[PDB]
Amino acid sequence: KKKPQIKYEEKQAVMPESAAGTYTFEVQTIDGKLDYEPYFTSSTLPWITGAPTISSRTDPNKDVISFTCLKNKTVWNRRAYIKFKDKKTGQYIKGADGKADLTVNIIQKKNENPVVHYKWVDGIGAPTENQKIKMKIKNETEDYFTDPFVFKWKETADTKFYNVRKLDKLYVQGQFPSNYFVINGIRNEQIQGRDISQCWAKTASNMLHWWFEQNKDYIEQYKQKAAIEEWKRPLYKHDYIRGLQDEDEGKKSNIANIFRAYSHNNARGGYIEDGLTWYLYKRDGQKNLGSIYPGLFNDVFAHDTSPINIERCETKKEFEQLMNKTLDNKRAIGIFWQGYQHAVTCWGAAYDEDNNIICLYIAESNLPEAVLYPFGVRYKGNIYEEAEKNRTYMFNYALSKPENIYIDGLTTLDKGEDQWKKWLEAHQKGE
Ligand SMILES: [K+]
Ligand SMILES: [K+]
Ligand SMILES: [K+]
Description:
This protein is α+β, with helices and mostly antiparallel strands and 431 residues long. It has 2 domains: 5-108, Immunoglobulins (Immunoglobulin-like), CATH 2.60.40.10; 117-430, no CATH class. Helices cover 17% and strands 27% of the residues. Strands 8, 9, 10, 13, 14, 15, 16, 17, 18, 19 and 20 form an 11-stranded antiparallel sheet that branches. It has a 4-stranded antiparallel sheet with strand order 1-2-5-4, with no helix packed on it. The longest helix has 16 residues, at 199-214.
């Protein structure tokens, strides 16, 4: 009497559709019918209902194994594993090489028709359908990314986000104006500013434009009530001119021009939070960041009352908690990572029906178009039984082979409403 065995060609994944259902695969039964029991390697996987079972043994050559899945609402494949226990010995059955356990890889396919909702940074509106631009797949082929959340948000006269671009990247030698980089400075001096490594400053400038717009009425009062230092008076405005051609980027943003003319362009880079501090209040660390120190609202804010925060994330739970808190608190968003420290601005996020964050809409100062670009959000480990670390990779749809960008954290800028309120109540009490 030969011992019956089971076999399965492991290179064959079992791939159920995204729909809910009971799905099957076949296990070969050799020399009879082994007494075994299938088991998922994790029993707490929420999208699998119960254990797998042997649902038919009528064919002498094969067993049918069944398992039941919930609908995959997400835009990612998801993975489970089935092993088999010999019921007499209690031991896991060996695979073809005789050493590894026999393991069947289950990969339930993604939702091809997700319902997506969006959350944008407070005060910048939301894209109209006419402002959403589909994206060609690059290798530019004539294929397009076809998932609805993959769009560029085109800047127009009517859009309210900010995306200041690096003049060093836009510049075409011999075609752009020779004076493309010239800036008229605070003392009406002419300065040539370069921005090739100023990712951090472009991100700070975008956030500062948003902050000056949000706090426009407070800043008007501040200019009328504070004893402003004479040289700083021209800095209490923000001009961001939409509709300019690339050759005119030097005229587009007074804030970006201040960083370009008076900060540094060190190839190591800088930090978003340092640019934000430098613009808004005095701190000893930023003493030598530039050749001037704007510190425009030190009467309102100090480091103790700071509207700037820095937080890190290393899991899907950490990233999503941070993003949702920031978006629900009317804060602007800078994203950083070590690549030199890289920095971009985030203006919003796309969500699937499970509230997973699936895409970010990014002002990238290194990228050429006057648009926000979609950066897809992906994970390499399980998102149901999360490991100690599950980095939130970012996928640049615009690039022809997108290297993985592990988000390190978020530098955020709050409106500072309580601080502004306390400042204003203090002046009216003295009046
Ligand atoms: K689930
Ligand atoms: K099980
Ligand atoms: K998964």
